[PDB]
């Protein structure tokens, strides 16, 4: 009777019950033992499932340990990355019906669900999490595959670059535990500058931008320009030696792969989602950059609401609890008759 919603991130699983405002379970997508509880291994790399046995351990941990449910008792909506291979969609569907014996399931694209969380069915999303970033233009709930852009530069890369630019100050962050310390520094202290060159000058001219952080050994480190240099990587991927254009350009390129007839609607409905869009200033920087690239009279709107770390999950919670959605589930009966490729007909 209650549907389950599971957004399986490269870094975090967000899971809970359709109709709720927030996931009840948020835990790391890792096995040594599983989740909150061998190395670590992350079974989702850059948003795509790469270790199916460990993915099954994460799904079992979600149902039994975290949610305290039997998956055979609930319709289950799962999420997937944009451009998820057809074979991966079929493998998830099979696991759910044959291993977990779900009565019904659905798989939705992450970025589509965050568009839905904003009350829209057409728009373009920038979804940036821990392992992957995408630009995803959507027309009436359809993600347009020829126009989707993927960038393997997201939160984990930003933490690794902040580690590198601090290390090059003499503060050495290299280990797994040290990486977690720097991820916390990044979340607490980083921001996106409106004008990177200007901010570089302010940093150097004043201590006004400085913040201090106490490390575990009671060393206190001070960071200045590292606060904005770290996420500036999203706009200048050359900072970590990537040749890709930054995320304002890839937004543009994505728009330009779509018909000119929908472009007004994409520019006026640019939704940001995922943990790596949380930086103070990132919406305003995007609005500035996309205004520079768009036609001169074009209306630009960036929608970056404060709940955006979980908007994929929230859109799933809305979707799976709508009365108009109840005929859209793949039922176990349909899976028994059609097998795993039913997922392509229905999702």
């Amino acid at each position: 009777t209650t549907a389950l919603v599971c957004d399986n991130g490269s870094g975090l699983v967000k899971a809970g019950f359709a109709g709720d405002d927030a996931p009840r379970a948020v835990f790391p997508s890792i096995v040594g033992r599983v989740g909150d509880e061998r190395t670590l291994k992350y079974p989702i790399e850059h948003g795509i499932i790469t270790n199916w046995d460990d993915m099954e351990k994460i799904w079992h941990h979600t149902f039994y340990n975290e949610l305290r449910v039997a998956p055979e008792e609930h319709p289950t909506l799962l999420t997937e990355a944009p451009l998820n291979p057809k074979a991966n969609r079929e493998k998830m569907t099979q696991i759910m019906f044959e291993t977990f014996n779900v009565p019904a399931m659905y798989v939705a694209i992450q970025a589509v669900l965050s568009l839905y969380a904003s009350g829209r069915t057409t728009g373009i999303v920038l979804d940036s999490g821990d392992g992957v970033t995408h630009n995803v233009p959507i027309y009436e709930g359809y993600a347009l595959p020829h126009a989707i852009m993927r960038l393997d530069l997201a939160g984990r890369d930003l933490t690794d670059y902040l580690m590198k630019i601090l290390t090059e100050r003499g503060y050495s962050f290299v280990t797994t535990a040290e990486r977690e310390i720097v991820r916390d520094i990044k979340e607490k202290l980083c921001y996106v500058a409106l004008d990177f060159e200007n901010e570089m000058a302010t940093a150097a001219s004043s201590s006004s931008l400085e913040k201090s952080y106490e490390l575990p050994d009671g060393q206190v480190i001070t960071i200045g320009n590292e606060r904005f240099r770290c996420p500036e990587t999203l706009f200048q991927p050359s900072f970590i030696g990537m040749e890709s254009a930054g995320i304002h350009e890839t937004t543009y390129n994505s728009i330009m792969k779509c018909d000119i007839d929908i472009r007004k609607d994409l520019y006026a409905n640019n939704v940001m989602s995922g943990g790596t869009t949380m930086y103070p200033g990132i919406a305003d920087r995007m609005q500035k950059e996309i205004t520079a690239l768009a036609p001169s009279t074009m209306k630009i709107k960036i929608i970056a609401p404060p709940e955006r770390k979980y908007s994929v999950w929230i859109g799933g919670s809305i979707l799976a609890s709508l009365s108009t959605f109840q005929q859209m589930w793949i039922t176990k009966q349909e899976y028994d008759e059609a097998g795993p490729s039913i997922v392509h007909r229905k999702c």
Binding site: D20, R24, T121, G141, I318
Partner: peptide, 20 residues
């Protein structure tokens, strides 16, 4: 309106979610 079109309309309407 197709069932898909009613679904898109419901998504645009939005809804209240339960506080956890």
């Amino acid at each position: 309106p197709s069932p898909r079109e009613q679904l898109m309309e419901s998504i645009r309407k939005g809804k209240e979610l339960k506080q956890i």
